[PDB]
Every structure is written in C-alpha cells, then in structure tokens.
Design a protein around this nucleic acid. Structure first.
Lengths: 476, 256, 128
DNA sequence: GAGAAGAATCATAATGGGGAAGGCCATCCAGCCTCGCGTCGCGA
DNA sequence: TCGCGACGCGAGGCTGGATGGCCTTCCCCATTATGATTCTTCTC
C-alpha cells in the first residue's frame, strides 16, 4: 500500500530525473540530444550533401518517442544550435537562431541542419556491437541508452540543470587541454590537482569573461562546490575631449545586453549620475562594441564598481557540479570523469577488438575451406559425377575432408572461373595476412598499454584534424 | 440484414428481417405428389402438417444437433460430406464391412472454423459409443519480425469460442500477473481474414507460453460428444453404421 | 460528434473530434494586455504558461469538482448562479451579514437533472 | 314542467411505412527503406 | 588472369489519411374508434 506508493514515488522520480535532469557520466549527453544524434546518424545523409530544411527528421524522432511536446524537441535542436551558449559544435545549420539577445525564431522547419563534423567521428562504431540497446515502447525499433565517445563532452560543454532536487552548473573547457589531461592521467595514475591546474589553466566560454579568483577554482575542482567571478571586459581609453571611455567586449555568461542596459538606464534615471548620456552599444556583428563614455568630473572606475554591484558586469557564478551514474547522483571531482571516460573507452576498444576477431576468424574459417578445396579438385569433381544431390555431395565432402556445412556449400559455390592456380596463391596470401592480423589482435588483447596507445592514436587523429585556443581571456 | 459475426452480439433486427433460402432444400424434399408422410390437422383440425422430414440425404446427420436441457443431454457433432458419401457408398456396395476400415475412409469430426485435432483414442471411443471429450487446439504460430521479436499468431479457434471474452480473459491474465512476457494484445483488419496477434518480448520461452495457453486458457478445447438417439419416440443410441442403415431402409421405402 | 447520452457508453471517436467552445470564456478571461499572472517556460524553457485562471466570476465555484483519489478526497457540489449572484452582492454591499440569512438567499445544492431534496440539517452542516 | 340518462356524431391521437441526410469504412497513392546484383578490388 | 565478397543504387511494397456512396432511424400524415355532450324521451 504505502510501501507501493513509495515504490511509485521512487520509480517515477527516477523516471523524471533520468528523463530531463542531468545525463550520464558516461556521455554527458542528455537522452533527448542522444536520440537527436542517433536519428540524425540514422538519417545516413552526409554533411557533405547540403543540410536539409525539414521537420521530417523531428517527425521520425516523435515516431521514435512521444514526449510532452515535440516543440521541446525543436527547442533542443535550437539550443544545440546556440553556439553563443553551448560550445563547438553540434548543428550544421543555416536558418534563424539568433544570439544571446532575446531572439525568437518561430520558423521551425524552415531552418536547415544536418550532421556535424564532430558528430561524424564522435559516434562511429555502431556497426561493431559496442553499445547495448533497448526496444522502444513502439516495439518496432531499438535505441541505445549510452553512446561511444571520442572525448569527454562533459568538460567540453557544461550543464545548466533544473532544481528537481537541485540544479547544476558545469563550466565548459578546451579541446586540447582536455586531450592533455587525458594524456596526463594516462601516463600517471598519481597526478595531483596542481597537475590539473597545469593541463587545465581554467574553464572557458564561447564568449569570454574574467575569473579573478583562484581558491574558488581550487574548491571547484576538488569539492565540486564554489562560486566564481564572471566579469565583463573593461578597456579604458581616451576621448579626444577628455572622457574616460569604457569599451566592453566580454560579459558574464547567460547575460543578455538588453535588460542590463535597461536597468542601467533605470539606475541613471533614479536620482544618480545622469550626465552619462553616452551609451554606444551597437555594431556587434563584427564582435562586441559595448561602449559607454563617462561624463566629465566623474571617474570611470566608480561607475564600474557600481555596475559590478549591479551584478551584471561582475557576477558570482556558482557551481553545483553533480552527476548521474549507476542510477545515483554524485558530487563531482576529477579522477571520476577521467577514470570513467578511460574505462568506457577501454570497454569500447576491447569489444571492438572482440568483434573484429569474430569477423576475422569467420573469414579465416572460410579461407581454410577455400585453400583445402584448392588443394585437390579433380577427384572431388569425379566423385560429384558419381552423385546427383547436393546432400549427397555434402556427405561425399564429409567423407573426403574435414569441412563445415558452410565450408562445403561455399566450395559448392565455385564456377569454372574458380579453377585457376594464381587465385590459389592470392587466397593463400590473404589467408596468411588474416592469420597475421588475428595474431596481432590476440597479442594486442594480451597488452594493456596498447589500448592506451590506440586512444593516443584517436587523440592525435582529432588533434591533427582540430584544435582550439583559449578565447576566454582569464586573468587571476 | 444485421446479425453480428461471431462475437456475442446477436443482432435481432426484426424489422429488417429480409431473406431467401439456400438451394439445398431442392435436394432435401420434393414431396408434392409423393405419398410419404402422414399429416396432423390444426385449426379446428383442418390443415396438414407432416410428421417427419424425409430426404434422400443424411445431410442433417452431418450438420449437428443441440438438444440438451430437456431431459438428458445429447448433440450431434459435425463432419464434412465427401468422405461421408464415400463410406456410405462403400457400405451400400459392401454390406459386410468393418468399422476401422471405414475410419480409414472417415476423418475426424469436422468444424467450420478449422480445428487442430490431436489423438485418436477418443475417436475410437466416440465413433463406436459417442461418449468422451477430445482435445482441440487453435492454429497458432511463432513468427519473427524484422527485429527478431517473436509473435504468437492465431488464425481461428475451436467451436463455441468468442474473440472478445477470451480477449478480456487475456487482459485478466495480464492483471492477474500469472503470465509474463506478453506485450501487445492486438487485432485488426479482421474482415479480409481473421488476424489476432499476441506479441511477446524477448527472453521469454514463447513455446512454453503456448503450452501455458493450451493448459490454462480456453483456447484449449475439451470438446465432448453425446449422441443418444431417438428412433420413433423411444430414446436409443446408435453406432455410425446403424444411422446409415436406417437411412438405407428409409430410402428403400421412399423410392418404392 | 458521438458521445453517448448518459447511459454508460462513452463514445470516443477521436477521428470525429470536431468542435467549438462556448461563449462563457469571453466572461472568463481576457488577459491579453492585463498584467495578471506569472508564466512558466517549457521547451528548453522558452514559451509561456500561466499559473492560475483569473476571472471576474465565481462560476467554477458553482460548477463542481472531481479531485478524490490523489491524497485525501474532496469535491465541489454544484449550485445554480442567480441566487449565488444575489447572496454575493449582499455580502458586497453588506460586509457583516450572517450565514442563515444568506441561506435564506441560497437554496440547496443544485443538480442538472433536477432532484428532489428532503431535509435541511445536512444543509446546515455542509454550508458550514 | 322539469330533470336525468342514453345513443350517436364529431374530433383528436397514435401507429406504421417510406424518404432523405450524414457517418464510417476501405482503397489507393507516394514516400522511404531493404535486398539483391553488378562493378571493383586483392593475391599468386 | 581469374574469382569471390562487399557497398551502393533502384525498384517494390506497405501504411495512414481523406473522400465518397449507401443504409437505417425517426418523423409525419391519415384513417378509424372511443369518449363525451347534446337532444329527446319518460313519469307524476
């Protein structure tokens, strides 16, 4: 009764939290977005072909699952097109998406998008039985609960959760810095937090800010709790008539210019400094030109500290930094993200190795049958002439030599083009090649460090392909 | 008009009662000139009514009977007609044949839906003495999808079965929590051909579930016989020979 | 379309779902320009949804409610509207009236079929 | 004268049959995915 | 040279939604019988 009500409470709370709160540690990818990328990979249409303008994709998404609104699925599409909010990059698109401005793109299917470049190598190896699957409620198609990865996007894109019990802030980071962190933890299981300070000088943004504190960053990467400073960029230049002109490019994150400017107008117009009727905040299609000019007989820095007291040019940005794994939430630190991603990639690589051994040893068994057929042929021909049935021919071949049923029938699959001797040598050559590759994979399976070397290989692949610098200029 | 197909809705539109007959009464009876049957008189005892229905045909042997709750119970289970004609004509040209050699001519007792029959000991008992229940199963198959999921697909059922009452009993078995694996209980497009599908998740041993169907559910049929005859008022009981014997001597008197 | 009148046949023709509304929402709510109610945002937290339904009208007091099996049970039995308007306006112009003198204004709890009501002790208990 | 009761005549209502309007069901059309087959590639 | 296997492309088939045709139910109209009221009839 009340225990069953508690069971309903527990199970339904798990349903809501695993539905729309923080995703798994293993991916950092929410299942809405997971199914977006899975169905867009299963569109099959390459990003090389010009990216499409349709709600047919989202119609197949809603055929895959019924939410409490596919407008929310389109919101997920658009929020993954928010490069100014969520970093590089998940949408190859063309249509209206705006900026961090207060933009409303009601043109839903009229936007264009398809697969993105990072998604291509990000979600390979589906054909290698790497990830498990579950059936939908529609009992017709399957879906994976997690994904294979080529980086911890956990660190690449942060989290802005909701307070089902409590929300979660997770800051973004840099590509190559994360690669160096992976290499560091790979080479040493004995790293420190100063090591993390080295390979990660600090969390960054697609826009940029200033984070002056140090021990808040320290408690952030250790305890998982703490708040930081997000500060706008400040440039003090000289007006030709003597005004301390303020140029602003960076901002605190999730801070529109519009309502901040309106409250600045209000604070001017509530019996305060009114001679600052100089707000040249435009031309922001080349960058950000947020320029004011402080009036005469007034210093810029006092108005700067007053707008920092307005909590919009300098903001205490907190961090909750929680996660979901094994059905439980967790307070975060590193060597957890790190070791989790490491052992996940270990799973992926080793299971890929097992599947490749499956294909290779199956084809090796085939070429065994091929070479044993191509040893002695004409006696088999003449005994086939003493038969009239492929079942009789199968029994004859079982009397002749040791084969499989598949092997016997594949040897039956031989026209007269198969009756040469050069192709015997070719099958023998690829047979020895395949045996060498099988022995290579077996020796790799008897090698722990070789897995890490393959991880280094894929890291160097994506590092030659792409890199990124710290656009977020942070002084401490 | 309006009847209801086979699912518990006997449509009784007495206003819409518009019909004809079939062409088999032309084989049944033609006694216009035929001095056959006595008559009984009704309205101040004037107008005829025949005693019996003579024929040239043991069709209504093969039809089946429903006379149960009056005193004791009896019925007539049905066969089909062709091998009936065969075995009858063999008795005609050969008046000294045996039973089981005509069981070589006679298949099992038939049903219009098309029933799976197993066992012949009850056949041995009931062709002789007309008593006993036999086991009957529905044409039921396991079918694989494009995904590898399995499906229990039935085609028909044995005699006196509702789709819908058994469907409610399936929904019971769901909420009774005494059977597992079952996911979809669906039924569509049934008027081009009867198609009811149960669909079950993987890792469930679906053939064991079919065994559980034909153990506990009403899909299994224990169909019993009772052919306790009446020959000129007094109650009797007949073998399959004696029925056709009385038929023979009736045809004798008919044609004479 | 197809509904079933009052005898246990809830006709659910989802294909035939063709309708309009009534003219009473024009009395219910007109908050276009009317700064009344906070909003909550849904699809990646964007689009509005109002918290409550303001009105000028206690009509839905007089409608009746069905909220039972969630925690504990409750309902709202219905009245009619005219003497409701009467007793309300009497409380409006007279903020210090008594209960039973408005029971003089208020008849029994009403029903759409038309019910024979006997007794008033339960009326005395349930209006309180 | 006067008063009451009975038979006959007129009007009203109900039953059945036929006509018309709208609703539900099946069929077809197009789009997308899967299978098979052909061209290419590898080895002696 | 020669043979087999694998990937990509085209064609076919199936599903859902919309549209049209025909069937059934209710209402109305006329005919016939019953009830009531009026005129005539009876007795001191």
């Amino acid at each position: 009764l009340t225990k069953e009500m508690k069971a309903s409470f527990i199970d339904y709370a798990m349903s809501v939290i695993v539905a729309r709160a923080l995703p798994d540690v293993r991916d950092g990818l929410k299942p809405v977005h997971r199914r977006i990328l899975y169905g867009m990979n299963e569109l099959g249409v390459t990003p090389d072909k010009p990216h499409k303008k349709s709600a047919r994709i989202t119609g197949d998404v809603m055929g895959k699952y019924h939410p409490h609104g596919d407008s929310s699925i389109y919101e997920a599409m658009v929020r993954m097109a928010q490069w100014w909010s969520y970093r590089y990059m998940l949408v190859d698109g063309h249509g209206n998406f705006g900026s961090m401005d207060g933009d409303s793109a009601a043109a839903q299917r009229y936007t264009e998008a398809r697969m993105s470049k990072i998604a291509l190598e990000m979600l390979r190896d589906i054909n290698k039985n790497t990830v498990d699957f579950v059936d939908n409620y529609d009992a017709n198609e399957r879906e994976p609960l997690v994904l294979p990865a080529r980086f911890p996007n956990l660190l690449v894109n942060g989290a802005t959760g909701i307070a089902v019990g409590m929300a979660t802030n997770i800051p973004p980071h840099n590509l190559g810095e994360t690669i160096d962190a992976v290499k560091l933890v790979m080479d040493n299981p004995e790293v420190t937090t100063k090591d993390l300070m080295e390979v990660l000088p600090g969390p960054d943004f697609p826009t940029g800010a200033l984070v002056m504190g140090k021990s808040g960053i320290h408690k952030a990467y250790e305890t998982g709790k703490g708040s930081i400073v997000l500060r706008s960029r400040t440039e003090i230049e000289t007006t030709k008539t003597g005004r301390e002109r303020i140029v602003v490019t960076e901002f605190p994150y999730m801070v529109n210019k519009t309502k901040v400017h309106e409250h600045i107008v209000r604070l001017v117009q509530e019996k305060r400094i009114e001679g600052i009727t100089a707000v040249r905040d435009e031309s922001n299609r080349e960058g950000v030109r947020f320029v004011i000019e402080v009036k005469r007989d007034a210093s810029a820095n006092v108005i700067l500290n007053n707008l920092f007291k307005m909590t919009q040019m300098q903001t205490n940005f907190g961090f909750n930094m929680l996660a979901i794994q094994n059905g439980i939430p967790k307070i975060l630190s590193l060597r957890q993200i790190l070791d989790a991603y490491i052992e996940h990639q270990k799973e992926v690589v080793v299971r890929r190795t097992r599947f490749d051994k499956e294909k290779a040893e199956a084809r090796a068994h085939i070429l065994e049958g091929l070479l044993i057929a191509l040893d002695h042929i004409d006696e088999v021909i003449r005994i086939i002439r003493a038969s009239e049935t492929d079942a009789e021919a199968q029994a004859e071949l079982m009397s002749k030599f040791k084969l499989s049923e598949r092997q016997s029938q594949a040897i039956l699959d031989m026209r007269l083009r198969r009756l040469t001797g050069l192709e015997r040598d070719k099958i023998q050559s690829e047979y020895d090649d395949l045996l060498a590759l099988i022995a290579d994979l077996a020796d790799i399976l008897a090698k722990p460090e070789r897995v890490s070397q393959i991880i280094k290989d894929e890291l160097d692949e994506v590092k030659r392909k792409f890199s990124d610098k710290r656009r977020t200029e942070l002084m401490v």
